[PDB]
Symmetry: D2
Subunit: 257 residues, 4 copies
């Protein structure tokens, strides 16, 4: 495949879009370093991933034919995340692609929702970049860093809940991370871009809370996780070698409507 | 390939990026309706394409194994452009993809440069869209319209020459066409996006005038026409089925620098 | 006032927003060079200004106490526009502020609508900038160029009509003009910015016709056409007040900006 | 003046731009609720404001002829900030204008710089909005909320230092706060906008650490890419205060959801 011999580090890889990236990039030949919390955060009113789900991602990727290192780790904890990445490096010996995908959407928790969404969705993305840079720079072969933002990183879409205004703030902060790192790493031939999905059919929105709590331009209800994985697989390939500093909506026209 | 059975209408197909689109989309299985002015505009201080160059594109596409209908046509003349497209529809029977690529960069012609760049780069893009819509809508199978803008469509980069100011104004106007047509056509599952290259190695910039007249974030001097064609080939594929309303820089970080 | 001793050149000054700029900047002490077509363009489905309306602007500004030179001129015709500007310069002796406000919204005219809206709303703005630059540069005291775009200069809001997609294209092109001229002219301390109103109560939209089309746009969309704040329409004075700030010393270092004056429409 | 009978809550009011906002809005007739940390933060290598400076802002505003309630408060501590605002509400009886101006620029502190800059410049701005909303909504007379971002809120103007990356991320996050609150509050006629200065002449820009940062950033680029477009070395605090005074006035009654550069053309360059 176009990614044979490369290694992709993916946060939130136990299910949802993170699993879709693991499967898609492995299908294209990449080996995978997969991390997920595999535990609950109290301000999040829907279940986060289980250890069983991370093991399921591992089986899918192994069946495709790639090597995979999978660790439980929390993106909020730099030492934890660094240790997990280093386990992947010890086994696979290189790093080419980073997909900073782990995220949460807390609600109905008061300001705990603000703090937790900033911590996972902004600080955790910072940590994901920071733990990867020294390897990418030392290797001297360029690479790709893909940050997962949202429509809410470019538009004021949300409710008054602290976790929702925090989600908007965090996802906007992720665009800032993208833009500064695209500038800092361009000289190293490391591309940095952000992806902005509107709604995607995953357990972040397919849950009891969201149904009880509860439009794109194209007549598309919700995107598939594969739509997001397909965009990312293009971006990290040689077909997109000179694409950097871009905010890419994958959204059936939502941001332009 | 992924585009077998589809037809792509490409303006400015005689050379440069237009040729690169014709070759890349044909390699993916598409048949081609190729048009070019194949004549000079007096305000443009470098040579435009010749009839022989359009014939050379035809040979390349036929050698790849796709069908191609090529006509001389001026994007400024709606009737000319419509007749040319119709020659292609009469032989190939359908239309799926439109690449509004023809463009000029006049200089040193005073206000004739202003007029000519608006007429080719803005009015000509409107005509390219307008003549394609009836077929796409009557078919009812969706499609893709790709408008070629520039860094100068999103940033104030230019000199005081009326042809240069006009290039900025026209390429900005192309973004506006993209945004309104993406909204107008979303219901028909017709995606509309714009591409924003910075510099590309073609005879628009590789000529005697430009040498006499006298950077990106990544250490890349100029992009290849293939870089722009690679982006477009992805956009018009099912891998980008829900991408619409986007301004996509293909620019080694120029717009983010 | 804060603009005493300065001169403002305003296109489309016979009525509407252009008249509002003339009276607002005159109230702050500016003298005025006012131009308008004062004639109809066949693709435009509502009446353009009359000669009597331009004369009425002149009286309003004289009653305020400023000097004003007014001429019938077409922004599409650089020579017409330059002659009119020069009549104003001969009388007032300087130029400080340019407001490129003339514009049209053709509809239901076929491709004549495309060509006319590009010609007035984009080429006419270019002409307005180009006739003014030499004076501003020769004086060496800086100045302000204010281009009137629209929400449709930053968003794809329009209908399936050559005049409407042309309005979007033109108003987006006006942002381009702003951005490149802000860079070209910054070294001369000439500020260049664009203003983006949503709907403003003038004869351009205060007609049966526009309300028809708004109703169809509304029905065709899944309050999409409405502002974020509960404000039905902005006053011309809202746009004139923004411009009066921008061209003052209170905004001396504001350049290269797209400024929405829109009750939150673009952010909605 | 145009703001006679109005009350403006300003964070970081002890010196710099915050003092300039207090003086400028007072000159237009407003009464002021002024808060500042009046203390140091270890990751910030230059001095923050002193209690003396806050008392000097009080003197300036009283001399202009307005009433002012000033309190020491940390925007990172929602309860502290709420208590300070309440002290001003208890005395002045209303609120019309919020200027979320307090901010820091940590550097050479490792990841403590990341955490502190997010905490002050993003979380602190959230707290400033949150403590003001109930009063604004209960009054039912509209109002203005102005968030102070930066060029670095719209462009990736930063170095690799965690405090700098964090400054870019936080200032971008402020735009997000603006956009969502403009939508949430529009129905109440409460305008929300953000201001994006480039460089402004205050201790944040002229200390030796920032100076060395600016020199390093200039040397890293091949393009005077760190300068403004107009030949203006640095903006005055009054340039930012003048823009805010306009925005909160009836001359800008329908301006909301806008990112406003005040930057001598920097972002467009
Ligand atoms: N689902 C949507 O509609 C949608 C829309 C736009 C953007 N996004 C974003 O896409 C990303 C992927 O989310 P998803 O839709 O696949 O939802 P998801 O909840 O199915 O997946 C998120 C994953 O991240 C993990 N995770 C959460 N906190 C973590 C932490 N502290 N450390 C390590 N792992 C952590 C979860 O356990 C989970 O497996 C997120 O950044 C999210 O904000 C989602
Ligand atoms: N080359 C660059 O650096 C660069 C950078 C950004 C964007 N662009 C854009 O890329 C597009 C392709 O240009 P290119 O780089 O391949 O340059 P090019 O000059 O090699 O190709 C442009 C082609 O369009 C044709 N054309 C010009 N006017 C025409 C008309 N009135 N009707 C029909 N055909 C006409 C030419 O004859 C030519 O074959 C243009 O829209 C251009 O503005 C180029
Ligand atoms: N009214 C709105 O809702 C709205 C919203 C956003 C932007 N705009 C823009 O505001 C500007 C002012 O328009 P308005 O609302 O006051 O409408 P208006 O029709 O009342 O005023 C426009 C004026 O320009 C004149 N004019 C038109 N073409 C001309 C030409 N070729 N040369 C010289 N003068 C010409 C008219 O005769 C008229 O007096 C325009 O650029 C318009 O596109 C209007
Ligand atoms: N100076 C520039 O060039 C520049 C450029 C763009 C944006 N900004 C921003 O302008 C705003 C004002 O900064 P300034 O230039 O006046 O600098 P400054 O350092 O002179 O003023 C900042 C003030 O905020 C206070 N403050 C800091 N942390 C606090 C906290 N936790 N709680 C309460 N008060 C706190 C300080 O003590 C001080 O009085 C900041 O948001 C800053 O990021 C500054």
């Amino acid at each position: 495949g176009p990614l044979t011999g490369k290694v992709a580090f993916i946060t939130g890889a136990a299910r949802g879009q993170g699993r879709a990236h693991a499967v898609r990039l492995a299908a294209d030949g990449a080996d995978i370093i997969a991390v997920d919390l595999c535990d609950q955060i109290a301000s999040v009113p829907y279940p986060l991933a289980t250890p069983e789900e991370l093991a399921a991602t591992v089986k899918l990727v192994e069946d495709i034919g790639s090597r995979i290192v999978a660790r439980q780790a929390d993106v909020r904890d730099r030492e934890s995340l660094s240790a997990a990445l280093q386990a992947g490096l010890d086994e696979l010996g290189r790093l080419d692609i980073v997909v900073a995908n782990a995220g949460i959407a807390p609600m109905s928790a008061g300001d705990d929702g603000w703090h937790d969404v900033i911590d996972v969705n902004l600080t955790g993305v910072y940590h994901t970049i920071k733990v990867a840079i020294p390897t990418l720079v030392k290797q001297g072969t360029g690479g790709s860093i893909v940050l997962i933002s949202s429509s809410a990183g470019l538009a004021g879409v949300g409710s008054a809940d602290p976790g929702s205004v925090g989600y908007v703030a965090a996802k906007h902060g992720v665009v800032g991370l993208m833009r500064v790192y695209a500038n800092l790493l361009a000289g190293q031939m490391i591309r940095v871009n952000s992806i902005h999905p509107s709604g995607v059919e995953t357990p972040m929105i397919n849950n009891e809370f969201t149904r009880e709590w509860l439009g794109n331009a194209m007549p598309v209800e919700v995107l598939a996780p594969e739509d997001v994985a397909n965009a990312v697989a293009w971006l990290v390939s040689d077909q997109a070698r000179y694409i950097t500093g871009v905010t890419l909506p994958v959204d059936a026209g939502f941001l332009n409507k």
